[PDB]
Amino acid sequence: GSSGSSGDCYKNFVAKKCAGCKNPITGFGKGSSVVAYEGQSWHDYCFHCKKCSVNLANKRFVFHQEQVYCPDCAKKL
C-alpha cells in the first residue's frame, strides 16, 4: 500500500479510468470529448442513462445508486 510497500507495486502516474467501460482514457492530440464529475470521468459514448440509454454527454443528469439517470428517468427513481 502506502506504508507497507509490499509486493511489486510501483507506478509513476495513472490516468482516470472510466467508470463505465473500465478502461484508460487516452487521447494525445488536438481535441477531447469526455465528461467529468466528482473527479470521475466518462467517455462521450459511455456517459448515458442506465435505463433508456440516452446520450447525456455534457448534458443534465442525476447520480443515483452509483449510476447515472437523466432528469426524466430520475423522476421514476
Ligand SMILES: [Zn+2]
Ligand atoms: Zn468509458
Ligand SMILES: [Zn+2]
Ligand atoms: Zn433515461
